[PDB]
Amino acid sequence: HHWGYGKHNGPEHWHKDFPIAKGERQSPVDIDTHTAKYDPSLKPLSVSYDQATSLRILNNGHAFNVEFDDSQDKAVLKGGPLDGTYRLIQFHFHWGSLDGQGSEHTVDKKKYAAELHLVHWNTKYGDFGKAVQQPDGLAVLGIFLKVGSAKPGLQKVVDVLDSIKTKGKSADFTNFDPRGLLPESLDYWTYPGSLTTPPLLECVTWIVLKEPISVSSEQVLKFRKLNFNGEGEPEELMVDNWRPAQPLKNRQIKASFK
Ligand SMILES: NS(=O)(=O)c1ccc(NC(=S)N[C@@H]2CCN(c3cccc([N+](=O)[O-])n3)C2)cc1
Ligand SMILES: [Zn+2]
Numbered sequence: 369h370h371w372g373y374g375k376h377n378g379p380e381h382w383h384k385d386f387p388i389a390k391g392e393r394q395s396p397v398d399i400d401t402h403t404a405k406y407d408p409s410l411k412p413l414s415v416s417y418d419q420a421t422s423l424r425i426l427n428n429g430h431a432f433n434v435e436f437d438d439s440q441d442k443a444v445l446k447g448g449p450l451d452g453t454y455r456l457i458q459f460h461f462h463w464g465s466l467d468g469q470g471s472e473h474t475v476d477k478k479k480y481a482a483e484l485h486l487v488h489w490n491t492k493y494g495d496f497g498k499a500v501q502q503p504d505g506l507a508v509l510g511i512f513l514k515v516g517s518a519k520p521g522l523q524k525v526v527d528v529l530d531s532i533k534t535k536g537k538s539a540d541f542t543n544f545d546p547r548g549l550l551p552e553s554l555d556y557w558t559y560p561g562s563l564t565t566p567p568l569l570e571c572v573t574w575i576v577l578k579e580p581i582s583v584s585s586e587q588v589l590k591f592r593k594l595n596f597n598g599e600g601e602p603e604e605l606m607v608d609n610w611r612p613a614q615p616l617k618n619r620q621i622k623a624s625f626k
Pocket of ligand 1: 458485487496497498500501508562563564565566567572
C-alpha cells in the first residue's frame with residue numbers, strides 16, 4: 369500500500385508515511401503574481417546545457433524520468449538565486465487527465481496542462497543522495513506547459529513513450545538536448561520548498577519560469593497513454609500525477625522581473 373495519486377494513496381494520505389508533508393516549506397504553491405516581490409539584486413539564471421549527456425528514459429510508476437550523466441559538470445544551472453553550481457540529473461513531467469489541470473504550481477490559481485521539472489543538485493554535496501538531505505541541496509527549474517502549437521524539441525520524448533508504457537520499463541535515450549524544452553524568456557519566480565513527491569524533503573530552491581511552453585494536443589495525449597501499473601497488472605492510466613498547492617506559510621516568493 370505505497371503512495372501514489374489514487375483515492376486511497378494520494379496526496380491527502382502522504383502525511384501518514386511522510387509527516388514532513390505538513391511541514392514549513394512544502395511544494396508546490398500558488399504563485400500570487402501580485403504579492404511576489406521583485407528582487408532587483410537577483411541574478412540572471414545561467415542555463416548551460418550545451419554538453420548535456422542524456423542516458424535513458426524510465427517509467428518509475430509515478431512519472432517518466434529522462435536521466436543524464438551527472439558525473440561531471442556537463443549540464444549545469446547557476447546564478448539566479450543560487451550560490452554555486454547545480455548539475456542536471458534528470459527531468460520529468462506532471463500532467464492532467466484534461467488540459468485544464470496537471471501543473472503542480474499554479475499562477476493566480478490557474479492550472480496549466482502540465483509542468484516540466486528539470487532537477488539539479490548542488491555539486492558541493494558530491495551526489496544527489498547527499499544533496500537531498502541539505503536545505504540548499506536541489507534546484508528544480510519548473511516550466512509550465514499549455515496546449516497549443518507543438519513543441520518540436522519535445523517530440524523525441526513523445527515518440528519513445530511507446531517503449532516505456534508500464535512501471536519499471538526503461539529505454540536508451542541518448543543525444544537528447546534539453547535546450548529544446550526551454551521558452552524564450554528566463555524570467556522566473558523563486559522560493560524555498562520541497563520535493564513534490566514522497567519523501568517530500570525540504571531541500572529545493574524552486575525556480576519557476578514565467579513563460580510557459582506550448583505543446584500540442586497530440587503530444588500531451590501521448591503522455592496520458594502511459595500506465596502507473598507494471599506490465600501484467602491491471603491498467604491504470606498515468607494521469608493527474610500532480611500534488612496540489614500547499615500553504616505558503618512563512619515564505620515570500622521573489623520575482624526576477626517587474
Ligand atoms: N517533483 S520534484 O521535482 O519535486 C522531485 C521529486 C522527487 C525527486 N526524487 C528523486 S529524482 N529521487 C529520490 C528522491 C529522494 N531520494 C531519496 C529518498 C530518501 C533518502 C535518500 N538519500 O539517499 O538521501 N534519497 C531519491 C526529485 C524531484
Ligand atoms: Zn516533479
